Amino acid sequence: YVREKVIDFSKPFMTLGISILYRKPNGTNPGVFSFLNPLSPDIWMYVL
C-alpha cells in the first residue's frame, strides 16, 4: 500500500507468503564416547 500511493497496481495473480527455509541435515553419533560426554577425560584420569 505504500507503493500503491506512488504507482498503480493491477489485480494480483496470487497471494505470496513469507515462510522459513532451513535444511534438516540431522545425523548420528555412537554412544561409546558420546554417552560419556559429561565425563571429560580429566575425570577419566581421576577415576582411573
Binding site: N37, P38, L39, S40, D42, I43, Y46
Partner: peptide, 28 residues
C-alpha cells in the same frame, strides 16, 4: 554449557586422598 568437574568436584579428590591416608594410618 556442557558438564565438567574441577569447581566443586575437584576438591572431593582431596577428601578421597585424605581418607585413604587416614584409613592406612588407622590400619597400622
Amino acid at each position: 554449557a556442557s558438564a565438567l568437574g574441577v569447581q566443586n568436584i575437584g576438591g572431593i579428590f582431596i577428601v578421597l586422598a585424605a581418607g585413604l591416608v587416614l584409613s592406612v594410618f588407622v590400619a597400622v
